[PDB]
Design a protein around this ligand. Structure first.
Ligand SMILES: COc1ncc(COc2ccc(C3=CCN(CC[C@@](C)(C(=O)NO)S(C)(=O)=O)C(=O)C3)cc2)cc1Cl
Ligand SMILES: [Zn+2]
Length: 291
């Protein structure tokens, strides 16, 4: 039986604050027809401005992943897009009453729960996948992000913080591992060493122990502890999954990041897209060879 596109079964609402802007924001997820993709929509503006969640619309990547259209921004899409990718949602509208997606608890957990509580709806159209046919890598200094052919979906990531809290590598093959259980609850994180500079630039205004792992010099400040023994590298993997979903289709292949971030993730997407001989679009009317 054919693998079909999926949208949301029902409308989903959530409230929160932007990690970086600190502004209160109302979020609304709505079903969308086949071949819509994920589309963000600023409903605080008149007319409403819609920005497709696609690599070509990525603006700055200095802190989070940001979408731009003219003068209009949608900040910090990566954790919600990761939740969307992890649940295989092809088509959806994401309405926002402000320029930044709410941070929630810092992870994708709340989004995957809200989505699954509403339910998913299968649609009468073949789901399209992007299959990696040949290796594609981008580098900058010692940082590196790579796509590798792989009959499945696998994300591996390595970070290199010289910090006592870290004393940092994980590979997740999603044919054996649940995104929901092992990745989705990984919270974003930041350092007291950086926060005075960030706040002076009006960044991370909404960040606190309520929505992030806050790492001091000599300890984590959150009194409740880590959700995963390797929560930090698992959050980087979460980030990559949402960043990679800006291809606009589920990936058949492997991502490897070494000290990568949103900027290098998007550069890898742009290199992949331009190298047409490195990938092809496939559907599964007969699912017997599907990974
Ligand atoms: C005593 O006074 C204070 N006490 C506590 C605080 C709060 O402390 C912080 C410090 C940092 C953060 C951040 C949390 C999350 N992030 C995004 C991370 C990223 C990996 C990501 O997850 N992207 O999706 S990244 C680089 O790619 O954007 C940040 O940058 C900073 C939150 C609270 C403040 C004061 Cl003043
Ligand atoms: Zn993140």
């Amino acid at each position: 039986s054919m693998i079909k596109q999926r949208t949301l079964k029902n409308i989903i609402r959530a409230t929160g604050v932007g990690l970086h802007s600190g502004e209160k924001v109302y979020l609304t997820l709505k079903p969308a027809p086949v071949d819509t993709g994920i589309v963000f929509c600023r409903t605080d503006l008149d007319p409403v401005v819609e920005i497709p969640a696609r690599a070509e619309n990525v603006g700055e990547t200095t802190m989070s992943t940001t979408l731009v259209k003219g003068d209009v921004k949608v900040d910090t899409v990566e954790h919600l897009l990761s939740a969307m990718a992890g649940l295989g949602i092809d088509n959806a509208y994401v309405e926002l009453s402000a320029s930044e997606v709410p941070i929630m608890d810092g992870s994708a957990g709340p989004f995957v729960f809200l989505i699954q509580s509403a339910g998913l709806q299968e649609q009468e159209a073949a789901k399209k996948f992007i299959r990696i046919k040949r290796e594609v890598s981008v580098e900058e200094g010692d940082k590196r992000a790579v796509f590798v052919p792989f009959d499945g979906f696998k994300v591996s990531f390595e970070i290199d913080f010289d910090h006592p809290v870290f004393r940092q590598q994980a590979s997740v093959d999603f044919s054996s591992t649940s995104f929901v259980k092992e990745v989705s609850r990984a919270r974003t994180f930041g350092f007291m060493r950086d926060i005075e500079y960030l706040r002076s630039q009006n960044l991370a205004l909404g960040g606190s122990v309520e929505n992030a792992i806050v790492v001091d010099e000599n300890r984590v400040l959150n009194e409740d502890g880590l959700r995963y023994e390797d929560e930090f590298v698992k959050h980087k993997i979460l980030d990559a999954i949402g960043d990679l979903y800006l291809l606009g289709n589920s990936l058949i292949g492997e991502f490897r990041g070494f000290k990568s971030g949103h900027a290098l993730n998007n550069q890898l997407l742009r290199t992949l897209i331009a190298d047409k001989d490195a990938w092809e679009v496939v559907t599964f009317e007969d699912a017997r060879t599907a990974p």
